[PDB]
Amino acid sequence: GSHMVGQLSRGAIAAIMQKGDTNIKPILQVINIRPITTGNSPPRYRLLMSDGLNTLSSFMLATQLNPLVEEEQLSSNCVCQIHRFIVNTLKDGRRVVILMELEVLKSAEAVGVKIGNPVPYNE
Numbered sequence: 001g002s003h004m005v006g007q008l009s010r011g012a013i014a015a016i017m018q019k020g021d022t023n024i025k026p027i028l029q030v031i032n033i034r035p036i037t038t039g040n041s042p043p044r045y046r047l048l049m050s051d052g053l054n055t056l057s058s059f060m061l062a063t064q065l066n067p068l069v070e071e072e073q074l075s076s077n078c079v080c081q082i083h084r085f086i087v088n089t090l091k092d093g094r095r096v097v098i099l100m101e102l103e104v105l106k107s108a109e110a111v112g113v114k115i116g117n118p119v120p121y122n123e
């Protein structure tokens with residue numbers, strides 16, 4: 001209940017970005033979800049996530065998880081546990097975190113607000 005930022009894995013974004021730790025199962029809040037421009041291929045969704053301290057904009061949902069967005073269980077403000085993810089590095093050096101398995105712990109409606117005051121992580 002109280003101490004809302006205590007619901008999130010503070011420091012997980014830095015851990016993912018700095019250490020490349022993939023064994024952790026961090027709890028993050030969805031701040032925003034947006035489709036990416038795609039061709040005739042399945043839609044892809046990019047997420048702005050928060051660990052309470054930082055936000056990071058380079059999350060992508062694995063296509064297998066698209067139903068979570070399209071049926072609305074995964075939406076802005078919800079709190080999720082990431083059970084499996086990988087990091088991929090693009091030609092230009094940018095890294096993207098692909099969310100492969102995730103659990104919605106609290107619905108957007110049950111949370112209702114951005115938790116804490118996270119600031120953008122500097123990639």
Ligand SMILES: Cc1ccc(C(=O)Nc2ccccc2C(=O)O)cc1S(=O)(=O)Nc1ccc(Br)cc1
Pocket residue numbers: 036044046047057058059060061062063086088090096098
């Ligand atoms: C469009 C697209 C889709 C997918 C991947 C990707 O890296 N996929 C994977 C890579 C490795 C393993 C698994 C996967 C997986 O998707 O399951 C990259 C791109 S992109 O670079 O051309 N544009 C883009 C990148 C990031 C963000 Br935020 C927004 C747009």
